């Protein structure tokens, strides 16, 4: 734990605020990786089909 004063209450509010921003930051990162995953999946099935024809 931490010995509670009025300083540590604001330090833990600051740590909570940083984690609440970090959750939304990593959700934006996951959205960019979803966009690139649906980018690559059609290229992978296209190359797979060309491999099938050859």
């Amino acid at each position: 734990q931490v010995s509670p004063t009025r300083m540590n209450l604001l330090q833990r509010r600051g740590q909570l605020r940083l984690a609440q921003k970090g959750v939304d930051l990593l959700k934006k990162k996951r959205d960019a990786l979803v966009a690139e995953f649906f980018g690559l999946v059609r290229e992978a099935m296209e190359a797979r089909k060309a491999l099938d024809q050859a």
Binding site: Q1, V2, S3, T5
Partner: protein
Amino acid sequence: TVAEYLAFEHDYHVLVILTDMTNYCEALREIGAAREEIPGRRGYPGYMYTDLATIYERAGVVEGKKGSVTQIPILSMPDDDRTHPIPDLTGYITEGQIQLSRELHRKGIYPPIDPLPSLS
């Protein structure tokens, strides 16, 4: 009193071990709460800085004489912090502390002195 006598009138090299000053501050909290007196932090009175100062600052060496007083107070930090008024005001009067760590003693290290929160 005996430390100042044996160091500054008979030229010894007195080392004082002041065991567990948290009991002294508990006794001051008792006698300050029985007098209806202005608290400081966590119920300890106003003059606790002055009384811990007039215990601690009766040490050192003097000019032109031979003796020396070396004080090692021992502190039982209540919730092992540096925010309780007893280790806090103790660290304010004194010159440096040596702080023990609960992590290193669980790891089995003796003396478990972490050097980051300690200084001289």
